């Protein structure tokens, strides 16, 4: 029922560290990761364990914060936009699958607010 998780490294990619990518890992991702609402988002949705047979019928591009954290640690992203795209995909999946007002949606809303606050301060 579960797909293989997303890849977290790109072997042919040159290593390119930047202040913006360090900010995405150590300010943005760290802030959300340590938050009391992080845990539903820290690993791929396990539809077998959670008894969600339709999750991966509805969600075609799975994404979670564990994948984003590993991608940043492995320098998978060429730039900040690509990383921000994965965070947005994670939030989008939550809002498309779960009914508005469900607990996980209220949690996602709060995490997204914090995400956007930190992204607004991305160093130039």
């Amino acid at each position: 029922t579960n797909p293989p998780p997303p890849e977290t490294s790109n072997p042919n990619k040159p290593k390119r560290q930047t202040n913006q990518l360090q900010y995405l890992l150590r300010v943005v991702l760290k802030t959300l990761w340590k938050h009391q609402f992080a845990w539903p988002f820290q690993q791929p949705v396990d539809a077998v364990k959670l008894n969600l047979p339709d999750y991966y019928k509805i969600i075609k591009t799975p994404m979670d914060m564990g994948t984003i954290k590993k991608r940043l640690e492995n320098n998978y992203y060429w730039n900040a936009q690509e990383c921000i795209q994965d965070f947005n995909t994670m939030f989008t999946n939550c809002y498309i699958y779960n009914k508005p007002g469900d607990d996980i949606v209220l949690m996602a809303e709060a995490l997204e607010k914090l995400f956007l606050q930190k992204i607004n301060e991305l160093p130039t």
Binding site: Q36, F37, A38, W39, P40, L50, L52, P53, D54, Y97, N98, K99, D102, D103, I104, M107
Partner: peptide
Amino acid sequence: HPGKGVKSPG
């Protein structure tokens, strides 16, 4: 579907 149910802060 019925979604994921109750979620408490961790």
